Symmetry: C11
Subunit: 87 residues, 11 copies
């Protein structure tokens, strides 16, 4: 059994948004960094399995993994463009 997740409620500032923006930027960027670490970690293992299992499903799912890995990396640069337009 896993311990239930305690949800942490952020402090929002509707009339002073720039500080919400700054924190959210840090959070998004952290997450994108976690994602790429996770994806790469998964890819290395997924690759060797797909090479050795000699089964089309392994290869098909590896292709889906790559598709996602590209989407993630694509977004990291898109983030800075969204930030530039906000500032």
């Amino acid at each position: 059994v896993y311990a239930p997740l305690v949800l942490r409620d952020p402090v929002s500032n509707p009339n002073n948004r720039k500080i919400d923006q700054d924190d959210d930027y840090e959070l998004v960027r952290r997450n994108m960094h976690y994602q790429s670490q996770m994806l790469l970690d998964m890819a290395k293992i997924a690759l060797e399995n797909a090479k050795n299992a000699d089964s089309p499903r392994h290869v098909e799912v590896f292709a889906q993994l790559m598709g996602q890995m590209t989407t993630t990396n694509k977004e990291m640069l898109k983030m800075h463009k969204e930030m530039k337009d906000l500032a």
Copy 2:
């Protein structure tokens, strides 16, 4: 049996819309933060399950979460853009 949800009813102000805008912004940001925590929590477990199972399904399902985590990230920054246009 789980406890039935008791629906909470918001106070709406059509003629004084900004009160609503502020509160709705605080909720949306709160939710998005919840979303990113829930996704992260699940991601870490789904990653380890996929690595040790040698099952394409587990990898596929991990990719789906990453897909969702990315969309969640995209929409956090797009939220601030909508606020900038509203203000």
Copy 3:
């Protein structure tokens, strides 16, 4: 056997639209809030479900909930843009 729903016919003013807008915005904002309340209640349960039993289907279904939760968050802020344009 559940009690059959009794439909509630609203009063509409084609000649006096503004009173309808406000009432409909009151209703829409209510439903929006209800939806986030429902989604969050389900997300918490679905997350623990997905974590406890090694079952990709539960993980897959949790992802879909996040996807739907995100779409509902998006529209809450787009509602305010729709109202600003109307006035």
Copy 4:
């Protein structure tokens, strides 16, 4: 066995449009209000079903309900913008 539907035929005015617009606006708004009642009625039940019967299908189908409930909400606001567009 249910009683067959008896179709009511409306009166159309091709060269005096505004009369038709006003009447169709009343119908559209009525239908949408019924729709949001039906959806909310099902949502509450489908939510408690999805929580209690530990099976992915119930959650998946609850997600599709929320998607449809969101889409119906969007169109209630867009209805009014369609009206403002018409002179």
Copy 5:
């Protein structure tokens, strides 16, 4: 055994289109009125069926109904916008 449908040929005027527009407008608006009646009649029954069945299929199919009910009601007002553009 139902009675074979006898197709009724309309009268067309390529060089006096105004009479055709008006005729086709009366037909389209009539059909959209029939659809909304038919769908609303279906939704009442489909709702109660999905409430008492305790099976995802019924809920799934009710959602599909709601989606089509939405599309129909949206195109009713869009019909007018097309007519305004024609005149």
Copy 6:
């Protein structure tokens, strides 16, 4: 065995196109009227079948008809708009 169809090759005039435009306008308007008459004939039967079958499948397909009834209606008004555009 149903009677084989005998295909009817029309007369075409690339250098004197206005004759063809008008001739095809009548064919299209006729076909659209044929479509609408057929769909309504089917709709009335499909509806009562669905109402009394207590089967999700029947509702699903009825929702498929309405979507097709709506699409045919849309293209009828737009047929005139395209004719307006042709000088």
Copy 7:
């Protein structure tokens, strides 16, 4: 066993394309006429089949033809736009 098709090479004029255009228009229009006839033929039979038998498939299949019949009609008008643009 049916007689194999013997393919007929068209005469093309790369530097004097107008006679290619004219013949290709005469082929396209012919083919579109052939299509609307084949669909109407099929639809007449498909409708009666979907009436006499209480069978969702036959309805579903009838709807798909109407969908295809609407698109064919749409493209016939859109053919006269492309031909107008080429001249």
Copy 8:
């Protein structure tokens, strides 16, 4: 068992492409005529099959042909527009 295809390598002109354009024009047009001939050949037969074999699959797949036959006719006229664009 069929004879293996022998691939015919074309001669290209990077710096005098007008010769390439013309040849490629004759090829594409040839292949479009080939396609419309082939599709009509299939349709004539598929329609009779769909009429006689009391199985929806025949009608569903016939509809797919019609969709495809429409698509192939759309691009015949779009070819000439593209050829016009190439000055």
Copy 9:
């Protein structure tokens, strides 16, 4: 066992890219031609299979070839527009 493919590494000129362009043009065109030859070869065989075997699958898959054959034809002319824009 087929003979493993040996990857032939091309020579690229980053700051003399026009040579690479011309080389790539001849390669792309060679392949476009190979494609239309392979598709047409397959289509002649697929057409007769579909006609004689009286199976919806054969008709369905034949339609997919044509769909793909139409696409290859499209890109062939679109290649020349891309070349025009590059020079």
Copy 10:
């Protein structure tokens, strides 16, 4: 057992990115060429396999290959536009 892949880290220069562009251009073009060789090599074999097996699946998958072969071919010339835009 296949040999594990050993990932080679590139050398990145954020300040003087022109060197990186050129290297990546060589990489991209090289890989696009590989891709073109790999598709062709497969196409030859799949084509004959589809012709002789008399099974829809083989023809279906051949069509899929061709669609992918066209996408690859399309992107080779679009690559040169991308570089011209960066120049």
Copy 11:
């Protein structure tokens, strides 16, 4: 059992974003290089498998790898365009 991943937190500077862009550009270019390497490594093995084992699945799955390989290349040169528009 594989060793659990340890997530590494980056340092983000919301009001000194250039440091972040440079580091992220390096990371994204590293990952895109990793992806192309992984995709090529899989493609080589998938190619021979598809050729040697007469099975449509292996060919289908290979095509999916190629699609994903093409997308990755596309995105490598877009990365630079994205960096150019940031400067």
